[PDB]
RNA sequence: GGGUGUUACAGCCCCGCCCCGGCAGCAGCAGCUCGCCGAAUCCCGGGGCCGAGGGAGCGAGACCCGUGCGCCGCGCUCUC
RNA sequence: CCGUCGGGCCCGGGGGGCCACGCGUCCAGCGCACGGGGUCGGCGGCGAUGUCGGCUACCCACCCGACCCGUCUU
RNA sequence: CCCAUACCCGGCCGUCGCUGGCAGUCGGCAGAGCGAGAAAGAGAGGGACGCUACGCCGCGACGAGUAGGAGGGC
């Protein structure tokens, strides 16, 4: 019995510990600790009693089967993956959607979701975009920001809250969460001159405009 | 309600002087005229958009007459502005000198 | 067996050269030590250019 | 210690080191 | 001399060649060195039981170099990334053939 | 512009004594005045192409029949 | 006698790192993973009379290549 | 900076080599191993596939060709 103490040595580099395996021995107090070394179920029946067996043999065999495959190690299912992020895309940046039906719109980033998709939400009263997921790949991170460090984003919204169901109707659940978050961002974007006018615009490329030549 | 791609001319295939390898396309994007300017465009998804006679189903739309060939920018070519692209189908030769789009969405910004 | 590069792939190297662990456990504490000592001398020079 | 045929008696001292 | 480009290798130059391109001639079969029990199985009669031993025998030419060096398959280096100067003439007269004494380490970094 | 000559109201170069005068610093983010390198070398990011192979076993073992994340290899926690 | 970030498990004597850990006598299980070759226990669209797919096999177009075979003959 | 059928890496076909491996499918007459750097002993007082052995399987290396020779043609 004992509370599990967190790992002593911090990760210096991925794969390499900060302390050697000798200093580790002198660190866990290992010097003073030398440890010296179903299926049958009986059920009565109205006679006698019969002994049922769990998981009886299959009743069908295919004419041939595929062999079991070898075992790899590094492969993890998607839910266990590590979710990266561009360092420029901090909470408060203004993004630009590039692929969806809301392309060209200067949408406002709030937070990261557990699936790596960005919870981006331009003010619906400005950009006509709701609380929306968006893959961070298809997004240009502009160098403009707003301090949304005091905004209270709900907790019940998650990668299951924006998951498609299966004629799309706006639930009242959406509308209450919409105006709740817009009631906190809309004061914080009108604190900057022309900022609400900026988001109402749509991004486009004119003649002589080269994306590599310009910078965001 | 605006353009969301950069203009790019399909110059030719990756050729030698007496052999051409049609699984690679040389792209000339407007404005970029040096290798150091191509760093922005590496990996960007490109598209040769044409239109034909019969109708084709459209992702998120009605059957139009336009069709595309999707590709991507692989690596910078030459010493000034050109770049190599690789498409899912080797580009038809009747697209030489025609406008193909390079988008922005696989962006590293 | 798919040959992996011991220079790129760390634990392939440690399967062959187990001393490379402490070789690389050092030369990082040392580099984070000389980078520390460099910064202090660069900081102490700005105190000599004022007085 | 790293010899099979004539290091058996040697590395029995380590086996008690875990004990 | 017109066909080779030789020189004197560096300590790092040996490490990269044995690790990245090291293949042992085990039973007349080119086999990669992904495990030390492939060396110690064949070179164990010369106290070489690891790769650092095998490098120590090659780099510091010892009295078991011959069995050690014949154990390694000839290195299949790649084409020189960066381009040669001139394949034909001697290194002294601008070319690349001949004894480029210490500069052979630069050639390895690109070909390896 | 020319003449003169020795710092003059500019500078340049050489010798010795000045602790190799002293002080930074150092093959220099004055990101380029000129080298060769890494057991005296490590970190990090991006782009491109590929994923061939498919019964590797673990443990109760004779006091028991389970489980298929398993060899090598690195070190994590607990039995303080 | 001087020199050496010398060599001798840096000979012996008066803050940082060590694949160093039993007494005595003589001269073991759980998990993480740069680990014996890819997986997802991740998703999205369009689909009944005009659309979907058909490398190839029919026609046409284009870029690149490409002189007519058999034979005797250096 | 450009590219050869050259070199490196990866896939697939075939040939060649290892005169390679497999009769061990040894199951309540059972007890699941012989990848192990080191001349020799796990010695006795209910359970997928397979192995047309002229079959199946694993490693390496290699591949131009007239005259000509041989082999295989479900």
CB contact under 8 A, A16 and C25: yes
Strands A139-145 and A132-134: unpaired
Distance CA A118, CA A135 (A): 6
Distance CA A195, CA A93 (A): 12
Measured in angstroms, the CA of D12 and the nearest CA of chain A are apart by: 15
**What residue has token string 């160098």?**
A143
Distance CA A190, CA E75 (A): 68
Resolution in A: 3.1
Distance CA B10, CA B94 (A): 10
* Strand G interface, A 26-55, C-beta < 7 A: 26, 31, 34-35, 37
CB contact under 8 A, B37 and A212: yes
Asked whether the beta carbons of E25 and E74 are under 8 A apart, the reply is no
Asked whether the beta carbons of A205 and B2 are under 8 A apart, the reply is yes
Distance CA B53, CA A114 (A): 46
Strands A93-97 and E98-99: unpaired
E16 touches chain C (CB under 8 A): yes
Distance CA E46, CA E67 (A): 9
Distance CA D3, CA A103 (A): 71
State chain E's maximal CA–CA distance in angstroms: 47
For residue A47, give Cα distances in angstroms to A44, A54, E88: 9, 22, 101
User: Quick count: other Cβ atoms within 10 Å of Cβ B14?
Assistant: 16
Phi, psi of A183, rounded to the nearest 5 degrees = -75, -10
The technique is cryo-EM
CB contact under 8 A, A15 and C22: no
Q: Minimal CA–CA distance to E108: which of E2, E1, E12?
A: E12
Distance CA A42, CA A53 (A): 9
Tokens of E72: 């390694």
Measured in angstroms, the CA of C16 and the nearest CA of chain E are apart by: 6
DSSP E strands, chain B: 6-15, 20-29, 46-56, 64-76, 82-87, 99-102
For chain A, after which residues does the C atom lie more than 2.5 Å from the next written residue's N, i.e. where is it broken?
37, 46, 166
Asked whether the beta carbons of A95 and A106 are under 8 A apart, the reply is yes
Distance separating the N- and C-terminal Cα atoms of chain A:
57
State chain A's maximal CA–CA distance in angstroms: 95
Q: Which residues pair with B99 in a beta bridge?
A: B9
Tokens of B77: 């070519």
CB contact under 8 A, B1 and A141: no
Q: What single string gives the DSSP state of each residue in A27-91?
A: TTTGGG-------EEEEE----EEEEESSPPPS---S--PPPPP--SS---GGGS-----TT--T
For residue A80, give Cα distances in angstroms to A11, A15, A77, A116, A135: 20, 19, 6, 11, 18
Cα dihedral sign for A203, A207, A212, A213? negative
**A36 to chain D: nearest residue by CA?**
D19
Q: Minimal CA–CA distance to E52: which of C20, B71, A180, A117?
A: C20
A175 touches chain C (CB under 8 A): no
Write out chain A residues lying below 8 Å of D17, CB-based. Answer: 34
Burial class (CB in 10 A: 0-12, 13-18, 19+), E48: buried
Q: Minimal CA–CA distance to A205: which of C26, B101, B53, E108?
A: B101
- Torsion angle of alpha carbons C17, C23, C24, C27, nearest 10°? -160
Write out chain A residues lying below 8 Å of D18, CB-based. Answer: 34-35, 37
């Amino acid at each position: 019995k004992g509370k599990p103490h967190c790992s002593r040595n911090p990760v210096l580099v991925r794969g390499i510990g900060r302390y050697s395996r000798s200093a580790m021995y002198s660190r866990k107090a290992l010097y003073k600790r030398k440890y010296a070394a179903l299926a049958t179920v009986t059920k009565p029946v109205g006679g006698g009693t019969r002994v049922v067996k769990l998981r009886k043999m299959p009743r069908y065999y295919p004419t041939e089967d595929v062999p079991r495959k070898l075992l790899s190690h590094g492969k993890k299912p998607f839910s266990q993956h590590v979710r990266k992020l561009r360092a420029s895309i901090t909470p408060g940046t203004i993004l630009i959607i590039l692929t969806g039906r809301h392309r060209g719109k200067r949408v406002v980033f709030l937070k990261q979701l557990s699936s790596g998709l960005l919870l981006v939400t331009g003010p619906l009263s400005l950009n006509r975009v709701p609380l929306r997921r968006t893959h961070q790949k298809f997004v240009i991170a502009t160098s403009t920001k707003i301090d949304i460090s005091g905004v209270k984003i709900p907790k019940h919204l998650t990668d299951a809250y924006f998951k498609k169901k299966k004629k799309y109707e706006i639930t009242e659940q959406r509308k209450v969460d919409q105006k709740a978050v817009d009631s906190q961002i809309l004061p914080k974007i009108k604190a900057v001159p022309q900022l609400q006018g900026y988001l109402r615009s749509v991004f486009a490329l004119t003649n002589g405009v080269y994306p590599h030549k310009l910078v965001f | 309600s605006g353009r969301l791609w950069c203009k790019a001319i399909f110059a030719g295939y990756k050729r030698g002087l007496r052999n051409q390898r049609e699984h690679t396309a040389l792209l000339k994007i407007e404005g970029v005229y040096a290798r150091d300017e191509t760093e922005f465009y590496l990996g960007k998804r490109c598209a040769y958009v044409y239109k034909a006679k019969n109708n084709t189903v459209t992702p998120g739309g009605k059957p139009n007459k336009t069709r595309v060939i999707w590709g991507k920018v692989t690596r910078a070519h030459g010493n000034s502005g050109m770049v190599r692209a690789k498409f899912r189908s080797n580009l038809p030769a009747k697209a030489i000198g025609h406008r193909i789009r390079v988008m922005l969405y696989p962006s590293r910004i | 067996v798919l040959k992996k590069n011991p220079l790129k792939n760390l634990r392939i190297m440690l399967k062959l050269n187990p001393y490379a662990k402490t070789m690389r456990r050092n030369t990082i504490l040392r580099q984070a030590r000389n980078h520390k000592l460099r910064v202090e001398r660069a900081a102490a020079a700005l105190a000599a250019k004022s007085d | 210690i790293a010899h099979p045929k004539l290091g058996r008696r040697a590395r029995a001292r380590i086996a008690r080191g875990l004990r | 001399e017109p066909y080779i480009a030789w020189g004197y290798p560096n300590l790092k130059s040996v490490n990269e060649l044995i690790y990245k391109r090291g293949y042992g001639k085990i039973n007349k079969k080119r086999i990669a060195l992904t495990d030390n029990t492939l060396i110690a199985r064949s070179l164990g009669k010369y106290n070489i039981i690891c790769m650092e031993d095998l490098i120590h025998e090659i780099y510091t030419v010892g009295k078991h170099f011959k069995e050690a060096n014949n154990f390694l398959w000839p290195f299949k280096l790649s084409s020189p990334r960066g381009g040669m100067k001139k394949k034909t003439t001697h290194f002294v007269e601008g070319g690349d053939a001949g004894n480029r004494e210490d500069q052979i380490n630069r050639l390895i970094r690109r070909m390896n």
